[model samples]
Target chain A: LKHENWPPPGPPAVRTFVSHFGGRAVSGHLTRAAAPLRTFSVLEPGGPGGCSQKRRATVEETAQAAACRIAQNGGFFRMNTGECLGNVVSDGRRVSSSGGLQNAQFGIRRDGTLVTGYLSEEEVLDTENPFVQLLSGVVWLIRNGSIYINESQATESDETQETGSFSKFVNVMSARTAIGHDRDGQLVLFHADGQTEQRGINLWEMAEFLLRQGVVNAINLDGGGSATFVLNGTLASYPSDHCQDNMWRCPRRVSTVVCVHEP
Target chain B: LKHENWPPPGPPAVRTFVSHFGGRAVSGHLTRAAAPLRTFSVLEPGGPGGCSQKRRATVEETAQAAACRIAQNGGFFRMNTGECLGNVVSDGRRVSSSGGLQNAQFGIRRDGTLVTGYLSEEEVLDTENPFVQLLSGVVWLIRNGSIYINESQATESDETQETGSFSKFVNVMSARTAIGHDRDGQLVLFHADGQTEQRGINLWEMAEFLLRQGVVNAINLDGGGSATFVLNGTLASYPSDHCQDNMWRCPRRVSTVVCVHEP
Candidate 1:
């Protein structure tokens, strides 16, 4: 339970922390900003509606482009194509709709009210809210102040997915990035190192860790190769990508990021 | 009103017709399908989040790609960038989220129930329903079996926009595309010729014509240069895009299209 304060000059709304579980280390930030603080969503200039703009970046790259102080890889996406399969509403614009896959939606309303919930694809397209920032994550790690991971819930999102697929999803050990709210309603952005020099932790372990940290509601954005975290525009977690290729170990270029910035 | 039954051997769910008002020509189809119909959204394969696929298409092109029997321009978009500004959910996937603009939405529930209503951007994202197809329009031409157009409502969507801009939007005469439902719940797709060889019709005229055709509710999908109508994969109504050189006079390429097809 080793935890220390992330020193000064960063946003007052967020507190950086480093902790360990079973000798495995984790890094994250807790955002207590009651209102919607500034969060930048990294995106390409073009779109599927026709713009050919390329909108992919690593945590550090997105932190710079967004002018934010802290960032983390936000959601699941197609690895080969880099299509964001998560919902993202950045800068008052809905960027992507979670590919009709039911998942955890982390949102910051225009009034700065941060919310986390699961929305069906229909709800994502028809949501009527004041949220100016919306990011998606893969599964709920905690719900209503409890560690909430279930094998049944794993298949709930995509029933057609093979049983073994979802089974492996929850049981597999890998690098993980998740966000949640602590008992006092502070925002917690977290990542665990796994599958590299640092071994990965399964979803069960990840959920247990956050629950002990007092996280109430949380969602695992993605794990394995896509897991990432950043502090002061620097890569802070050891991604699970292999060390073979030159670009393999670098911050994997991602389609979306959840950044914490000044209010 | 000159009304005629469309030729045989097509979808029984729809009937095509051609008529004229004030010597201005109009062409459209009536779809009585009571459930969600298939709609193919033409889009680039690339996306803002990084995929490099081109998804733009003309009305005729979209008809071909969709394999639809009837098609018309769907919603407003950024003409300069070909980005769809209106909400569009086709093939069970939401292609766009209306850019958070308050506008009329036409949808087909999975049960084939056709619905049309005005939804705010938030509503568009938070909607929880079984719609497999949702298209957006700029203004309401008919609501509750009545022609509904207001100068005040025009400014309601974007008050920050210049008064003159929206003022011109409703009053400016041009080729128009619209859709509605008759008293019997028949789907009506209509378009008027304007700003071209024949003449153009304003939103008021567009509403009046639909009202006479027994439309109970309708939305002006778009007008002016974006107006388009197609049947049997053939360009029907003359688009407002001028005839100049290679691409000018052709069926204008639009971001979305409301198509009618067989069950």
Candidate 2:
């Protein structure tokens, strides 16, 4: 129930924090003169879509929702508030972004007992299907208070292997993510970024990493740029890629999702 | 517009002379097979949501409507008809038979026109994210009805590019697909394989591979392991994997697809 940031976005967001993990901490925004990194703009200002390509960092209100432009012409992955097997969505992008791809994703944490996150990819390429993996491990750690060692050495590397031995494990070059609960019972979303300043920035691996860090149950959300969690109206955790900026471009995937609120 | 095999297949599917593909040609029954495939059992079997699983080939009837199951755990992707996206689809694991991934593929004509074939993976993958280079080449060929080429020669046997070689083409990994002309179209549910004979067997690439065989405007149907396209109560193609036999222990990802015809 906590809201991050105060005012709405300044120019337009080029960065955001996707709520793949659950936390009463709630995402809020704090207007800053500048940020460490500059977010890239993907919109064509005067194009047919008339998409906004400007960037800024600021906040507006104690909003309950955070919206952004489906900048990437992919599909959408949505998770409705209350539904089982959330819908992996696609806005029907035929032969590329010519038409536009609406891909949406969201997370839902109900009663603080069940937390689910989803990422829907069209039936193409590796989904980097990691939600189940990361969640299974996170759930186990939360319920059993121990790490669930996966027989897959590669997954094991992502879980237990130190950053130095990342090569020892098979590199799963697909979008990966993780979700976990912190000791304080705060849900955290950990995404992967191969080239992040700090190694090991996968969506699934991050959730698992936090789980190993003593976070309770967690799950991953749709990653790979489509992964963003806008708070009240600001960027809680700036996106590794351009988190803010732009508006709906018809997500490739979308489904209802659950959100967290204070008790 | 045409119904082929009926009242259970005998040995080989008997063909009735029908005018299709611009001539009075023998359509119906792709082969002289008795019945479509076989009905091993239902998907859920006897659970509360008793969804059945058919281990059979795709026939005009079954192909009209089919579903993809996750596995023994019970969940499937139902193929929806009555909607058109310019495509035709056949459900089940006729194309891939590893007993893990079920499927359906759509076929397009050489003229970038949809054909009455099955669905392919490539078609779906390209929906959202189209290739900048490769896709442009494909469009050029389709529009001009010719060939375009790009060649790269390696100077050294072990030469490596510092900032990564050859631009990696990006395409939609998850999105909706349809193929057809005017009113005659079919839906192809495609699920990219987590494990397949070919690595990176994305639906877009899968469709592209099929397009080479004179398919145009192909769409995607449910793929991956849950990609099942059953026809006439028979398994149409070779199943790459099965939930009961192979994937029961390992659950696969899935969503709802559409099916056609009446029970």
Candidate 3:
């Protein structure tokens, strides 16, 4: 699935790319392949389960704490409480679990296999289960090597009765961040700028772009203003939050950041 | 699998009997047949997960707490912390999970199916796997209509490398409490008291007695001094726990009690 090689940048395992989808700026960090897999983590400035850090946090802060080589904003959360709205686990321990949220998740098992699915109410509370790292997501934009937009084999297996809410967020053109593996089983950290409504790319368009980029499976993370990408402890994409008609840019404080590092 | 009725004692669903095995005082309660399926509950005086119920608890107190019709001491636990050594789920919520203990359990699923198995590490932590009520036990004495002693079709499925720990305790003649269903699918609550060393019935002898009584599948609960049974809010049998030199007897304070009642 190799295509036009971008100007060689960053380390061999970690590389950066800038592409355009529907005239909107799409930023991506194609990092660490599946074999010799990297470490996956969900972190906040206060750490994995610390939601009451009181102050706000940025993905940059989360990456710096773990010395993460690649990172993106994680899951949906309560803005006021910084509470993640779904299941969360790190270091073989549960951070928080609210499985009724019906969101998909990217999990790293004890054996280092990356799995993605909708965790059931039982899975979140199981003390004897087999996952070591976990983070939540809204929906799969690319499911099973097919364009899904707001659908997924993962959510379907969990028996979600309605996917109406999923489509509600994905139908709109807005800032977006997503994660999955590409054809070579390399991790894809994708972000599309929607700083202004006119520059936004809806999930349908985003999935098509990702398909061409060779991404076979991708789950949409906390997007809109929270969509962000941190590369080497620095902001790698323009965040949607803007002041005075896009004059100045600022990234929204997120509850957690899904981070990955070279082993 | 019908046996000679001992004495038309209690309600139709609940009955009591006193039998002898190896000259040991074998007391039995064939209570609440499984057809109408009684409510299964596990409780500690401090409540389900409350280790600080610092005050000692008897089967009497636990039975009274739930107004239970039948009761027996629950799984093994730490005397100092009151922490259950294995999995504990009450009313659809987990109290504790230490599956490494490799103990067997009797669990009632959401659909009222009584499942008996050795919970694995994953099963203990799974928030989505189904089981509404659960209580742990040492090992199966009678399995699939045959004598098992410390062995089980359940433990073998969980792949326990060693079962030496199971037989070490079964060889000793002591007070024992076990629960299972008879050939008629009626719930069997059995207790054999070893008021003195000479009167105690080892598990091997007890299993033979159980087999003759038409017990199909049974798991041995924590025995030794912790075995106590309550019926109609009264101590039904003499506890092996006795005063100095067998002068008088006082039942041991148990961590949790498993109670059942008819609909």
What is the number of backbone collisions in each predicted candidate, taken in the order shown? 34, 185, 17
| Residue-level lDDT for B111 in candidate 2 | 24
Using lDDT as the measure, the top candidate is 3
Q: lDDT tens digits, residues A1-263, model 2?
A: 11011111123222112122222111111111111012111111122121112211121111122222112211122122211122221111111121222111222221122222222233222333211111111112222343332312322213221223434322323233343344443334443322232122333344344544555444333333333333323222222342135321111121222122221
- Backbone clash tally for model 3? 17
Give lDDT tens digits, candidate 2, residues B1-263. Answer: 11011121122221111112222111111112111123111222222121223222222223223332211111222333211112212222111111222122223222233322222345433445321111000111111111211211111111211112323211222211222112212222222222232222333344443344342233233333443323333222222343454221122233222332221
Q: Which residue runs does candidate 2 get wrong by more than 4 Å?
A: A1-143, A149-177, A183-185, A191-208, A236-254, B1-263
Q: How well is each residue in A191-220 modelled by candidate 3, as lDDT tens digits?
A: 665533444567787778678778767777
Off by over 4 Å in 3: A1-263, B1-15, B23-32, B35-37, B51-56, B124-129, B150-168, B183-185, B243-246
TM per candidate: 0.42, 0.22, 0.43
Model 2 chain B: worst 10 consecutive residues (lDDT sum)? B132-141
- True-vs-predicted CA distance for residue B185, candidate 1, Å: 83
DockQ of model 3, rounded to 2 decimals? 0.00
Best by TM-score: 3
Q: Report the C-alpha displacement of residue A43, candidate 1, in angstroms.
A: 5.7
